Amino acid sequence: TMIAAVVEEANGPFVLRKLARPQPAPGQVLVQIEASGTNPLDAKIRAGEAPHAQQPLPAILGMDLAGTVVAVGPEVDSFRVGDAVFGLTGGVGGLQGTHAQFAAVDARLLASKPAALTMRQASVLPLVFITAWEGLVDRAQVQDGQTVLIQGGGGGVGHVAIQIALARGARVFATARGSDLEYVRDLGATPIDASREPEDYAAEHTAGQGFDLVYDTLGGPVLDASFSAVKRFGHVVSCLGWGTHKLAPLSFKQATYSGVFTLHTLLANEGLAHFGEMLREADALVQTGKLAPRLDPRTFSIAEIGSAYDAVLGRNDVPRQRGKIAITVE
Amino acid sequence: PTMIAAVVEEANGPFVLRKLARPQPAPGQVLVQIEASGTNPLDAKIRAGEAPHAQQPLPAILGMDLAGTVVAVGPEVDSFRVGDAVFGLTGGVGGLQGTHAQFAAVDARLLASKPAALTMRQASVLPLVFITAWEGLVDRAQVQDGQTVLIQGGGGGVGHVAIQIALARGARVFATARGSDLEYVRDLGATPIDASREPEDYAAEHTAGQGFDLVYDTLGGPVLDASFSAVKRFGHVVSCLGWGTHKLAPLSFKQATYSGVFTLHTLLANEGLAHFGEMLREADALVQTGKLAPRLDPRTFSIAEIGSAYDAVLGRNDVPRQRGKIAITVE
Ligand SMILES: [Ca+2]
Ligand SMILES: [Ca+2]
């Protein structure tokens, strides 16, 4: 058996329960979770308002993890007992979440934890790094020298998208709110107050031409703002492009737009190997000091998960997360 | 709009003055124009990157105590109006912006009107130590009128305020201190005890050898062991620095009790926030009746001399150690 937090019904509390401990099937390893990375989507799932996540209740939530391999299933040779690992492993599509002491994970989803990171630090980068990578690299194939605008540079996907873009040689700019402008500047990017109009910051920073690549990490009206900021023949990508939008800007500018939906891999069981690969890329960036997760200093035990999400969403009067929130399971 | 703030960029790095975005008050918060920033030894431990319990990684703006004026109020706030002078323990830990800044957006619950009789400097050094002293003496020990109370380190930060709280609540107060502070402790109205004397000796002279009903250790380490030695049978010992390993035998022999004090939890976990402003209201009530006066080192330091301010707090680089607490004048 093991201890895990279960959300029994919509909007219900994170109930600590003693449950049967998962056993690794062939191709899987058993991970003793030390840190669980939170994400806003978990809150939507908890509230039963995340149809795209296909994670009906009751269920153990949490998508990212960082821990140690304690058992290896048959047909596995990529990891050994004692190895520190991390990755985006479940919490969606019926997959057991990471708000647990243990999880049986397909080895392809894991990568060794970067030696330079604590478990907390490593636990918050899987989903957002993969989300940023899929958009910047897989879809937009960002090139050295291109001008890149990250909408919401202080956010989960934003701060990692900025660092990936910089590492790949792009000239990076990022819109952020007051409290995050200094953070973005320190990363090496050019900060832009998010209250400004695209026509204005594009004028100041791109001679009014627009940006080669715009990564919308906020969605809604921000995606429209992104269409406005993109250069002719440019590319716009979004990881929250679920709404309806006027497309005229893309035609007038003979531009391109791509959608990003990282969850597909776990929901449909396809391209699992690509996850471990992307995480390996992240590790390389950490080793060379070009990637550092933004981790809120606050700690939360497996018994304080509710408070963890209050922080993630800045609800019930707790300051909003400044960087991401990690739960210390062990 | 922007503001000037001192930022510690890396472990042991200098206090770097920077022009940064001025904070904006969210619902439930008020924007405080900081006039005085109160220092504390912990800030230096955080600066050196050796304060894990503080959860304040760098780069960051340090400083936990403040005293200033409300210049803007966020939505849903009715406890304070623009222009109100306030003071409180507001940040410097758990990722919260420190007070070495011209402004700070603070949850109204953490604030209390500044005592009218105190200058901004005086009020700025009161929050943390008062709250620390109060949680031990009242919340944990519930000091009662007539009880004998021994404050270990009466001239120190928590010590001098603990003495005054205990006296105000009717207790017979005694305090151990080093030479230079013995006179100060006597002045407060407590019976001074040279810190070099043994517990069995001062307990004999002042409690007929019975010991004290309540002992507050503000120094920790060996001083906590000495506290276990000075406590009366069935007595209570509290400490705000009880992190080490100690022999507990004395507590069984004396069928006594011990309680720990850790004020930071409130700010690190965001629970019991309202209790902070409430305790500071208690402090204001004591100042008002002339029963509480913070010990403030006469030396002054501008936002540009923070490094020197802490040299004083720690008595580093030849500078004389603080005699009372050190306050930074921001505005
Ligand atoms: Ca996030
Ligand atoms: Ca002090």
Closest CA to B231 of B262, B207, B195: B207
Distance of CA B131 to the CA centre of its chain: 6
Interchain contact, A307 vs B269, CB within 8 Å = yes
Quote the ligand 1 centre to A324 CA distance (angstroms). Answer: 6
Interchain contact, A319 vs B96, CB within 8 Å = yes
SS3 B230: helix
Interchain contact, A297 vs B56, CB within 8 Å = yes
Q: What chain A residue is nearest to B9 in terms of C-alpha separation?
A: A186
Residues of chain A in contact with residue B265, where contact means CB-CB under 8 angstroms, are: none
- State both tokens at B111: 């604030």
Interchain contact, B21 vs A181, CB within 8 Å = yes
Q: Is A306 buried (19+), middle (13-18) or exposed (0-12) by CB count in 10 A?
A: middle
Q: What chain B residue is nearest to A193 in terms of C-alpha separation?
A: B21
Amino acid identity, position A312: V
Q: What chain A residue is nearest to B76 in terms of C-alpha separation?
A: A317
Q: Within the 95-124 window of chain A, which residues sit less than 8 Å (CB to CB) from chain B? A: none
DSSP assignment of B109-170 equals GGEEEPPTTS-HHHHHTSHHHHHHHHIIIIIIT---TT-EEEEETTTSHHHHHHHHHHHHTT
Residues of chain B in contact with residue A296, where contact means CB-CB under 8 angstroms, are: 95
By the CB < 8 Å criterion, does B268 face chain A?
yes
Beta-bridge partners for A31: A69, A103
Integer Cα distance of B244 and A55 in angstroms: 46
Nearest CA to CA, how far is A307 from chain B (Å)? 9
Interchain contact, A181 vs B57, CB within 8 Å = no
- State both tokens at B280: 């500071």
Integer Cα distance of A69 and A81 in angstroms: 5
List, in order, residues 6 or more apart from B34 with CB less than 8 Å away.
B66, B67, B68, B99, B101, B102, B103, B104, B330, B331
Q: Is A2 buried (19+), middle (13-18) or exposed (0-12) by CB count in 10 A?
A: middle
Spell out which residues have Cβ within 5 A of ligand 2, the ion.
B 157
SS3 B20: strand
Interchain contact, A297 vs B57, CB within 8 Å = yes
Residue where the block lists tokens 């922080």 = A311
When scoring B58, B270, B271 by the number of chain A Cβ atoms within 10 A, the one with the most, hence best to mutate, is: B270
Helix and strand numbers, DSSP H then E, in chain B:
11, 15
SS3 B254: coil
Integer Cα distance of A65 and A263 in angstroms: 15
Cβ atoms of A60 and A100 within 8 Å: the answer is yes
Q: For this experimental structure, what is the resolution in angstroms?
A: 2.0
Quote the ligand 1 centre to A124 CA distance (angstroms). Answer: 9
Q: In whole angstroms, how far apart are CA B93 and each of A57, A297, B263, B276, B303?
A: 37, 9, 11, 15, 19
Q: In whole angstroms, how far apart are CA B266 and each of A120, A299, B49, B89, B128?
A: 22, 13, 21, 10, 12
Method used to solve the structure: X-ray
Cβ atoms of A87 and A29 within 8 Å: the answer is no
Give me the domains of chain A, ranges plus CATH numbers: 1-124+293-330 (3.90.180.10), 125-292 (3.40.50.720)
Closest CA to A151 of A106, A62, A217: A217
Closest CA to B245 of B278, B264, B221: B221
**Orientation of helix A156-167 relative to helix A126-133, angle to 10°:** 50
Q: Which helix (H) or strand (E) holds B257?
A: strand B257-260
Residues of chain A in contact with residue B21, where contact means CB-CB under 8 angstroms, are: 178-179, 181-182
Q: What chain A residue is nearest to B109 in terms of C-alpha separation?
A: A317
Per residue, what are the HEC states of chain A?
A: CEEEEEECCCCCCEEEEEECCCCCCCCEEEEEEEEEECCHHHHHHHCCCCHHHCCCCCECCCCEEEEEEEEECCCCCCCCCCCEEEEECCCCCCCCCCCECEEEEEHHHCEECCCCCCHHHHHCCHHHHHHHHHHHHHHCCCCCCCEEEEECCCCHHHHHHHHHHHHCCCEEEEEECHHHHHHHHHHCCEEEECCCCHHHHHHHHHCCCCEEEEEECCCCHHHHHHHHHEEEEEEEEECCCCCCCCCHHHHHCCCEEEECCCCHHHHHCCCHHHHHHHHHHHHHHHHCCCCCCCECCCCCECCCHHHHHHHHHCCCCCCCCCCECEEECC
Quote the ligand 2 centre to B327 CA distance (angstroms). Answer: 11
Which region holds residue A110: left if phi is over 0, alpha if psi is between -120 and 50, else beta?
Answer: beta
Q: Which helix (H) or strand (E) holds B222?
A: helix B222-230
Cβ atoms of B69 and B36 within 8 Å: the answer is no
How large is the C-alpha radius of gyration of chain B?
20
Integer Cα distance of B185 and B167 in angstroms: 12
SS3 B36: strand
Interchain contact, A297 vs B28, CB within 8 Å = no
Q: In whole angstroms, how far apart are CA B225 and each of A130, A220, B162, B246, B260?
A: 54, 62, 19, 7, 14
List, in order, residues 6 or more apart from A54 with CB less than 8 Å away.
A92, A93, A94, A267
Interchain contact, B21 vs A182, CB within 8 Å = yes
List, in order, residues 6 or more apart from A308 with CB less than 8 Å away.
A38, A300, A325, A327
By the CB < 8 Å criterion, does A77 face chain B?
no
Closest CA to B135 of B155, B165, B110, B108: B165
SS3 B249: helix
List, in order, residues 6 or more apart from B164 with CB less than 8 Å away.
B188, B286, B291, B292, B293
Residues of chain B in contact with residue A299, where contact means CB-CB under 8 angstroms, are: 55, 268
List, in order, residues 6 or more apart from B321 with CB less than 8 Å away.
B312, B313, B314, B315
Q: Quote the DSSP letter at residue B4.
A: E
Integer Cα distance of A113 and A26 in angstroms: 22
Residues of chain A in contact with residue B55, where contact means CB-CB under 8 angstroms, are: 297-299
List, in order, residues 6 or more apart from B207 with CB less than 8 Å away.
B148, B232
Per residue, what are the HEC states of A26-63?
A: CCEEEEEEEEEECCHHHHHHHCCCCHHHCCCCCECCCC
| Chain breaks of chain A after residues with C–N above 2.5 Å | none
Cβ count within 10 A of residue B119: 15
Interchain contact, A317 vs B94, CB within 8 Å = no
Phi, psi of A120 (to 5 degrees): -60, -50
Per residue, what are the HEC states of A72-129?
A: ECCCCCCCCCCCEEEEECCCCCCCCCCCECEEEEEHHHCEECCCCCCHHHHHCCHHHH
- State both tokens at A41: 């989507």
Interchain contact, A297 vs B59, CB within 8 Å = no
- State both tokens at B103: 């402004």
